Design a protein around this nucleic acid. Structure first.
Ligand SMILES: [Mg+2]
Ligand SMILES: [Mg+2]
Ligand SMILES: [Mg+2]
Ligand SMILES: [Mg+2]
Ligand SMILES: [Mg+2]
Ligand SMILES: [Mg+2]
Ligand SMILES: [Mg+2]
Ligand SMILES: [Mg+2]
Ligand SMILES: [Mg+2]
Lengths: 116, 60, 59, 100, 131, 172
RNA sequence: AAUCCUGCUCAGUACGAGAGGAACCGCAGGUUCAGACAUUUGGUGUAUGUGCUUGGCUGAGGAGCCAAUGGGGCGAAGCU
RNA sequence: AACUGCGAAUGGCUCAUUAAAUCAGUUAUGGUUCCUUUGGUCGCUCGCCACUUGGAUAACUGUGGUAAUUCUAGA
């Protein structure tokens, strides 16, 4: 029950099995048996070898995002107040815009008076 | 193991330190951007489904 | 609900700054007090006078 | 099964002990190799020495016992491990197809 | 402390191993192994972590016709690492050291076997990596 | 562990400097005693426990564990007023500066012992309570008193007497 | 029929002006030799086991064969 | 503070390379490109938001990892 290794060929290597090869470039590989080891030393790609894990995965052998609409508060405001404001009665809304219309009217009255 | 948890609707994201790989196997050997349930993190965490957003190595 | 996390919602840091953004956020139809409907942030500190200012609405 | 493996397996390798058979009764595990072929009778005797060195008085706590096939370069501990790794096969498929 | 366990030897007298230091030596021609009491007709052999006497055949002319102590850092023969790991390297390698054990060079190219590194701490410190 | 300003501020004093050197026979604890004093006092010296401090500033000194070249260290520390009352000499404030010069204790380095002794005006003799008065402690004492130095004694390695020698208190 | 050595501790200790510098108990290992064994690593390999492949031969395919073991890759058991 | 636009291809240093190569004079690019500056051109084409659209993304609030970098992640 040491660390469970894996060969290049993808199989699990249990302790006491196989052999481990260290290269001059500081890279270390593990081989399950001399069949795997000779295949690596002859530099055969494991993706053209049928019985290897990589080939099975490559050839597909053996084989949603979230949208949210959170509505929160805004700093400097109130949580209940903002929902109440965004859900205000259309009669209040039309009363607000008409009193804005006359507000622009009386500002036109003030602008004409100031221009005089 | 520290584990930052973030709730989008409420914020105040916190850090939960856990010292049990047995209950951490729910996230082990998973991938990020996949949705898994943290119910094994205690019954207080029952019914809770999370998604992996990021993470840092032992070297940072 | 875990304490501290699933409670005490922190409000969004800034309110919307674009005209269509505030219009959709408040379901305004056609020019309904849009100038004053932007959220006016109050800043308060002890060694001075607390005040409030509203952002610069664009578009 | 060791105190850490917790796996349902017997001492027999995958495929039975080569040239011996299935070991059912009690057994004694011994460090190293002993004389004789397989299925050769051996007389275990209590030691005539007084064991006082550290190696003699040392406790032994196993963590894992290998049970891969000794009939070649086996690579699977248990049947369940091998069936989980390979998955469905041709013999399994046709036998399931016929039997339904 | 804990002595090193036996390993497969692999490099008898006459082995020419790469020189992984930066002394300018290209290879080491092993001529004997330290601590070998020998036997009739048996070649004295050396594994990793063993101190040998070697002469450089290729390398700078100031080192060539001389005997140097050396330490084998990598061996190509596979050896058991006391927990069933049979390790072997791409090449045989060794560095030139003195009797004290300080490494004559200042840098090592390639890995160093754990057995050699733990015996010789100064070789371990100059090692780029440990296999 | 203070800056060079107060270094100069107490350096202009002449009534609280104490030039002294430690003199002993080979392997009598001189390096050990100096290191502990560098830990305790010191103008900027801390309390590092890394075996021998700057008193062995050579690579071969640290490799062989032989003190070869003498190294000068300076100590600054203060004492309470009731502690000052015993100092009947010219006393100016609670601060005190010590210029210690660690002398090697071999017979061949007797010249280095002279060079330290000319500079210093007092001496802390270190005598091993196990080995008694040795040949070199005898020589360095002869040297200092010939050069008019006030020697003050400290028996070292008293733990050796009480554990390795198992001496009872009377014979101790 | 066992043998010898090294590392650690004792201990930079005893002894010695100094330089230097041990020993007994204990621990960890190695050398030479002996007796075994094949779980592991390696070697062999005509299981003529399974692929590959040259020349030829069976009308072609398939399946094979001959070339004193055609050659070569990987290789169970066994021996080592 | 940050996005965006521009600059960082100028200047400064040195003379290692280089013998129709560099370079000097001359000459062509009717054999090519060209931010920037200026002057042309910007309703010339018939084609349920325009009283003006969408998703964000910074800086920013908060949770940090790393021994360490003008490292960055998570909401
Ligand atoms: Mg604008
Ligand atoms: Mg077998
Ligand atoms: Mg002979
Ligand atoms: Mg043919
Ligand atoms: Mg055919
Ligand atoms: Mg024929
Ligand atoms: Mg013939
Ligand atoms: Mg073979
Ligand atoms: Mg540009």
């Amino acid at each position: 029950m040491k660390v469970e290794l894996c060969s290049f060929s993808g199989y699990k290597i249990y302790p006491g099995h196989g052999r481990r090869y260290a290269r001059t470039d500081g890279k270390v590989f593990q081989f399950l048996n001399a069949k795997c080891e000779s295949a690596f030393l002859s530099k055969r790609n494991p993706r053209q070898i049928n019985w290897t894990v990589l080939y099975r995965r490559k050839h597909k052998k053996g084989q949603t995002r979230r949208a949210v609409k959170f509505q929160r508060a805004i700093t400097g405001a109130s949580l209940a107040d903002i929902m109440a404001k965004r859900n205000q009665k259309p009669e209040v809304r039309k009363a607000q815009r008409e009193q804005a219309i006359r507000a622009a009217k009386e500002a036109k009255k003030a602008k004409q008076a100031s221009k005089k | 193991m520290k584990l930052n948890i973030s709730f989008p609707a409420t914020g105040c994201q916190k850090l939960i330190e856990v010292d049990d790989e047995r209950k951490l196997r729910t996230f082990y050997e998973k991938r990020m951007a996949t949705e898994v349930a943290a119910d094994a993190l205690g019954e207080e965490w029952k019914g809770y489904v999370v998604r992996i957003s990021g993470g840092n190595d032992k070297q940072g | 609900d875990i304490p501290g996390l699933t409670d005490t919602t922190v409000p969004r840091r800034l309110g919307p700054k674009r005209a269509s953004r505030i219009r959709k956020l408040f379901n305004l139809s056609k020019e309904d007090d849009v100038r004053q409907y932007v959220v006016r942030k109050p800043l308060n500190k002890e060694g001075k006078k607390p005040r409030t200012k509203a952002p610069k609405i664009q578009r | 099964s060791t105190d850490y493996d917790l796996s349902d397996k017997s001492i027999n390798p995958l495929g039975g002990f080569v040239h011996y058979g299935e070991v059912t009764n009690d057994f004694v595990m011994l460090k190293g190799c002993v004389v004789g072929t397989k299925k050769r009778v051996l007389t275990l005797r209590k030691s005539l020495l007084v064991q006082t060195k550290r190696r003699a008085l040392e406790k032994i706590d196993l963590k894992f016992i290998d049970t891969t096939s000794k009939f070649g370069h086996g690579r699977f501990q248990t049947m369940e491990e091998k069936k989980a790794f390979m998955g469905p096969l041709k013999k399994d498929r046709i036998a399931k197809e016929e039997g339904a | 402390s804990g002595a090193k366990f036996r390993i497969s030897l692999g490099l008898p007298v006459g082995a020419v191993i790469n020189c992984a230091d930066n002394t300018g030596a290209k290879n080491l021609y092993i001529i004997s192994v330290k601590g070998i009491k020998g036997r009739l007709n048996r070649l004295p052999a050396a594994g990793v972590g063993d101190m040998v006497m070697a002469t450089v055949k290729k390398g700078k002319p100031e080192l060539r016709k001389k005997v140097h102590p050396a330490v084998v850092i990598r061996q190509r023969k596979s050896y058991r690492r006391k927990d069933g790991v049979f390790l072997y390297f791409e090449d045989n390698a060794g560095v030139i050291v003195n009797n004290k054990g300080e490494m004559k060079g200042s840098a090592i190219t390639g890995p160093v076997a754990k057995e050699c590194a733990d015996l010789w701490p100064r070789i371990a410190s100059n090692a780029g990596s440990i296999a | 562990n203070f800056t060079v300003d107060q270094i100069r501020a107490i350096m202009d004093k002449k009534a609280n400097i104490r030039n002294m050197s430690v003199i002993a026979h080979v392997d009598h604890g001189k390096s050990t005693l100096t290191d502990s004093l560098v830990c305790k006092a010191g103008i900027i010296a801390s309390a590092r426990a890394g075996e021998t401090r700057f008193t062995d500033t050579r690579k071969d000194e640290q490799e062989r564990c032989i003190t070869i070249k003498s190294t000068a260290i300076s100590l600054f520390y203060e004492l309470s007023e009731n502690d000052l009352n015993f100092i009947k000499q010219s006393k100016d404030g609670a601060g005190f500066l010590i210029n210690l010069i660690d002398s090697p204790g071999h017979v061949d380095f007797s010249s280095e012992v002279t060079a330290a002794l000319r500079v210093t005006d007092g001496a802390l003799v270190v005598v091993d309570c196990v080995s008694g008065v040795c040949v070199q402690t005898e020589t360095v004492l002869r040297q200092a008193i010939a050069e008019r130095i006030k020697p003050v004694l400290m028996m070292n390695k008293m733990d050796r007497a009480l554990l390795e020698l198992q001496l009872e208190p009377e014979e101790l």
